[PDB]
Design a protein around this ligand. Structure first.
Ligand code: CL
Ligand code: CL
Length: 162
């Protein structure tokens, strides 16, 4: 298992503009297009992201090209961030995947706000991190997905995804 398979499970694949769990226009593998209520603003972000006239639909290849870019951007965002990088460098490879999942989902600003959890992850207090991560809007809005990510941080295995 790897970050690409993890995120494909958590996010799904849709070839047509759709609204995410928050009501935002989204396409592909969790690629957020816009927070604006306008479907026209979303289509126009879509054409710009892809470099053609999509008319709100994209192929599998294009969805996967966006996906690759977003994973890459999530990683590079972790490495440039002063709060995130020390935590990340300290984790093993499975639990790095879980940090990328969270950043992909909620942006580096979001994750960097999980201060107490970050500190516990850094000290390798797995069970206490899991409890603290659970006390969050993120866990209450998307519990199934949040449990899978939390379990990964707690156990350092891919079990929740198998
Ligand atoms: Cl883009
Ligand atoms: Cl969920």
């Amino acid at each position: 298992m790897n970050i690409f398979e993890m995120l494909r499970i958590d996010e799904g694949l849709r070839l047509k503009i759709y609204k995410d769990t928050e009501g935002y226009y989204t396409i592909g593998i969790g690629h957020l297009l816009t927070k604006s209520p306008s479907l026209n603003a979303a289509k126009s972000e879509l054409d710009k992201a892809i470099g053609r006239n999509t008319n709100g639909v994209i192929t599998k290849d294009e969805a996967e090209k966006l996906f690759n870019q977003d994973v890459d951007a999530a990683v590079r965002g972790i490495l440039r961030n002063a709060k995130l990088k020390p935590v990340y460098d300290s984790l093993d490879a499975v639990r790095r995947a879980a940090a990328i999942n969270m950043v992909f989902q909620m942006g580096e600003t979001g994750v960097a706000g999980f201060t107490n959890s970050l500190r516990m992850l850094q000290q390798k207090r797995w069970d206490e991190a899991a409890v603290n991560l659970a006390k969050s809007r993120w866990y209450n809005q998307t519990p199934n997905r949040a449990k899978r990510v939390i379990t990964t941080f707690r156990t350092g295995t891919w079990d929740a995804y198998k």
